[PDB]
């Protein structure tokens, strides 16, 4: 809208109320659209026996397809946007403007891989709220998208050559952050909920659970195959809720032709860490908290009292 001159604003992408508001709106956007046949949430408020709230309702099959959502300034506030082509979300931004609303965000719910998002204008960028903390998500933004083609018949395809090149660029950026004398290793998820251990996402209204081991099984800068990567997948009916602690059950698929091709534009990872005189770092696919997903798009925005 209007660029600000001489104005230098201070940003902190890890404490940004836009992320929370959007997280709530996307949650409510899911309830009125994708209703579960059964929904289970804990309730142990009382100091004794636990209780499960159970809701049962009509659960129409819906061929879900996210329309881009814009975050617009609420009454009494304004949106400041950092224009730096490579901004890490923290510190002062010298090139800043004011905007009506954000760019259009796709409210995709997924783990491990960020789909149909924004690419880094220049080089691959990696972000974290605390790189020293091995427990904090590391958000990766690619500058070149990588296609992932999935079918309800039980698999996702990814071009191997493209993925390998992408990994080489991630590893470069990682040792730029953790030490140029370090070997970078990618490994499969170490464990936890299925939604988190597999590349998990929803496609054509269905929840896919894809084994991503083949994507994360390589060593880089250590010493010195098949055309495509085919990840085996599973559509499931009993899902762990991402909106809060609980479980949902949906009905089996009614389509024999579930298909959706996405672009991988980013990754969510965690670093192993731990006291080790070993000059190498291990990285595994992560995610689960969709706020990381929203942060991957909203890092350059900030809401301010007018």
């Amino acid at each position, epitope marked *: 809208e209007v660029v600000l001159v001489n104005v230098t604003e201070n940003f902190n992408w890890c404490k940004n109320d836009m992320v929370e508001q959007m997280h709530e709106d996307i949650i409510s956007l899911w309830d009125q659209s994708l209703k579960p046949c*059964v929904k*289970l949430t804990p309730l142990c408020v009382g100091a004794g026996s636990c209780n499960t709230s159970v809701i049962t309702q*009509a659960c129409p099959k819906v061929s879900f397809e996210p329309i881009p959502i814009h975050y617009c300034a609420p009454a009494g506030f304004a949106i400041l946007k950092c224009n730096n082509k490579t901004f890490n979300g923290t510190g002062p931004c010298t090139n800043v403007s004011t905007v009506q609303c954000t760019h259009g965000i796709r409210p995709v719910v997924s783990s491990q891989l960020l789909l149909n998002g924004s690419l880094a204008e220049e080089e691959v960028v990696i972000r974290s709220c605390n790189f020293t903390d091995n427990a904090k998500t590391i958000i990766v933004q690619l500058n070149t998208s990588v296609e992932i083609n999935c079918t309800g018949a039980g698999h996702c395809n990814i071009a191997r050559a493209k993925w390998n090149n992408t990994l080489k660029q991630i590893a470069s950026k990682l040792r730029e952050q953790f030490g140029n004398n370090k070997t970078i290793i990618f490994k499969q998820s170490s464990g936890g909920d299925p939604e988190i251990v597999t590349h998990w996402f929803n496609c054509g209204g269905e929840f896919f659970y894809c084994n991503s081991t083949q994507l994360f099984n390589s060593t880089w800068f250590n010493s010195t195959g098949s055309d495509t990567i085919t990840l085996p997948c599973r559509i*499931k*009916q*009993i899902i762990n809720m991402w909106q809060k602690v609980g479980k949902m*059950m949906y009905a089996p698929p009614i389509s024999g032709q579930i298909r959706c091709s996405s672009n991988i534009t980013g990754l969510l990872l965690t670093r192993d860490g731990g006291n080790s005189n070993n000059e190498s770092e291990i990285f595994r696919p992560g995610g689960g908290d969709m706020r990381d997903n929203w942060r991957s798009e909203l890092y350059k925005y900030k809401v301010v009292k007018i």
Partner: antibody
Amino acid sequence: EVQLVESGAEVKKPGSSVKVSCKASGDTFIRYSFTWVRQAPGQGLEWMGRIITILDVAHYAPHLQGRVTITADKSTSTVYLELRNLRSDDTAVYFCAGVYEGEADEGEYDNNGFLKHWGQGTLVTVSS
Amino acid sequence: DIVMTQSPATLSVSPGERATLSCRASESVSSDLAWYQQKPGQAPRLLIYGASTRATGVPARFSGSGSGAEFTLTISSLQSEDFAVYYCQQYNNWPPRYTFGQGTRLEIKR
């Protein structure tokens, strides 16, 4: 293939409660859903309710809502039917029945409404 | 509430001949329809599910057809062990409120 064995015949006064059981053996318990169906002498079959064992969630027929409870004990592979405030017209043979729902422990669930496996039945007589 | 209605109440068939059993619904139940066989003193036995899929152990002379609000059970050649009571069951609705027809008694015509 699961084998369903139900508990013995029951005789109750009107106004009492009854709790009949059903031991499922032969297969993986939490991969089945279990349904209770009853049949009054000389009458047809009547669906009473069904439990999604893996989730521990049961749904009941409207004319029964409020006085029927279906439970499942996973440590013993046993399904239970409780019918409260018994009436003389509750006299019937009560059948335990079940069907395989898929690899439920991996989140696959067909929610089948049909009934492949059946117990031998339990006669419940309600009379003064 | 979905009311299932079977006809006729009693079907009399000479041995070795074909029997046709009817089942109707008060509203569409798509293909969530099953057929059971029951002999005096015994539990019901699943024959057909999904309107037309035979259960394991069910011989080929049993076939189900139809969808929506009208269904048929056909037995192409009645054997001695086929004479029994036959029930249909609808399981289309959610929340589940599944219901049975009142049965067709198939007896030996002499």
